Symmetry: C3
């Protein structure tokens, strides 16, 4: 076999501006989550009661999602972008953060979300939201970090939310907010649909910061509940 | 023009692509000709044929095309295709019309930055920015077997038939519909669909040659 | 892969440069039951244009105020005085009197917005607190008759909501490009428009401000 390498050939065209690198790194670890409930008022068949997204946090099969998504589920289904579908067990949940942890049991290696514990999110950072709006299939939307928390009391009622204008819709809750490197910045929350005044908000969404999310996950895995 | 290239900008894509995107008006008799609906169109190649969506020009008594340079021409229908929702128009202008950049070698990738170019609410040509959000989508309607690019570049009534382009100004798609199905009153945000350019060019060529898509 | 040494794409430089000079503006209404609390009649934003404490906002934000309150991102809160307003351009100028230095918005008088330029909108949507949203310049005025009825609006798809009016639209260098105003929120067909917002170009806004400061009003 010839010991010398052959030239590698590459595109002859200019490179389009793109966040595909972040997508390739992060999106395989973001799953579609389905809450199925027995329809008691029919023949007890399972049906999708609500849906959202989730993030595979480690190779063992632990997944973070939102508690409201999986509340009162008779069966929780997790679908990966490679086509695999699993039934998940509920490990635990925390109402104070609206986070829940699921566990799946898989034979083949699981993709995991990139996490850089030393990365500090900054206002103005470009972010991608990854989730399953309206069950159309995994969708990537792009925005920036609009705020990283609040000092004063405010309409979210919270002080540590990330805020973003990456389009968030029903189905995105529990999914990932990542930066342009594919690093997890947060877990997207429920969508903000209507203002107190009755206006339709545009480009206003919230996420639980990743540092808090991982801390809560670890507690739920270890103890099955958050003791404070 | 002495254009200042300093700020972060997609003006390069705009200057290359936007002159080739036209405003399309579907006018019907009343007493007189009123606008029934409107959209956009893309001047595709040196031949000067314009692509738009069939739903934009359907049942039109008169089709008007307005170029960004201020000229206004009646357009004549070359052909259309219901399955792909595409139509091709010709205008009676002399040649040399600005054309959209097209790169047949380019594969749209999820995450690519894109600009939507069209005429939302008859405001005049409008550029909005997003990314390719997904590929191979059946669209707003759950039943179909067509393939769409999905984008979060904001599109509104009046964008249909318009261009979706990348940072190079290359045509990625023809914007076609916005997802608007609500669960319980909320408004879907940032979910729009476009016909991939590769399909649009294949259908255009068939309509130019045969006047219809022969299947 | 290992992304530790990689740098996230960011417009934080523009935010750090411009955001401190963008204030929350509150139009307070006392009514009968809110004499001793802040009941908000109207919500908006404003831009500190110079160290003296002159602030640009929109006239509709401050119309009919019993009191005008301005809050800075550094936590300072001031009573603001109405210096003047211009109905034609829907601009108003406020004045605050502060002991400590004030942040001012970056201005590059030679820079002009171009279609496709990346922009950040900075304001106080829904009283959430200062919020940065990102879009591009969608249009720079219109030559002919159009649905805004005006010819000089910047149009942008940076998300704008109630509370943003009077705030800043800045480019990637943090330079002021315009003053955000009301967005297109409901079409005649009953649809909800997305990504259609308008701003007054900064050159026009600065001219109006200068006149209002000098005369208390635009003299024709």
């Amino acid at each position: 076999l010839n010991p010398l390498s052959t030239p590698q050939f590459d595109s002859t065209d200019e490179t389009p501006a793109s966040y595909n690198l972040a997508v390739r790194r992060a999106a395989p670890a973001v799953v579609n989550v389905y809450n199925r409930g027995l329809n008691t008022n029919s023949h007890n068949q399972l049906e999708i009661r609500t849906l959202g997204s989730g993030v595979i946090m480690d190779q063992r099969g632990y997944i973070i999602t939102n508690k409201h998504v999986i509340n009162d589920a008779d069966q929780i289904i997790v679908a990966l972008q490679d086509g695999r579908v699993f039934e998940a067990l509920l490990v635990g949940s925390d109402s104070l953060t609206d986070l829940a942890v699921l566990k799946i049991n898989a034979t083949g290696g699981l993709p995991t979300i990139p996490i850089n514990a030393r990365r500090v999110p900054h206002i103005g950072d470009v972010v991608l939201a990854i989730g399953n709006p309206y069950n159309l299939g995994q969708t990537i939307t792009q925005g920036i970090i609009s705020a990283t928390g609040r000092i004063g009391l405010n309409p979210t009622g919270r002080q540590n939310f990330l805020q973003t204008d990456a389009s968030i819709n029903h189905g995105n809750s529990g999914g990932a907010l990542v930066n342009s490197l594919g690093e997890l910045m947060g877990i997207n929350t429920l969508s903000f649909d209507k203002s107190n005044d009755g206006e339709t908000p545009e480009g206003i969404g919230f996420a639980i910061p990743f540092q808090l999310a991982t801390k809560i996950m670890d507690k739920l895995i270890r103890d099955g509940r958050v003791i404070r």
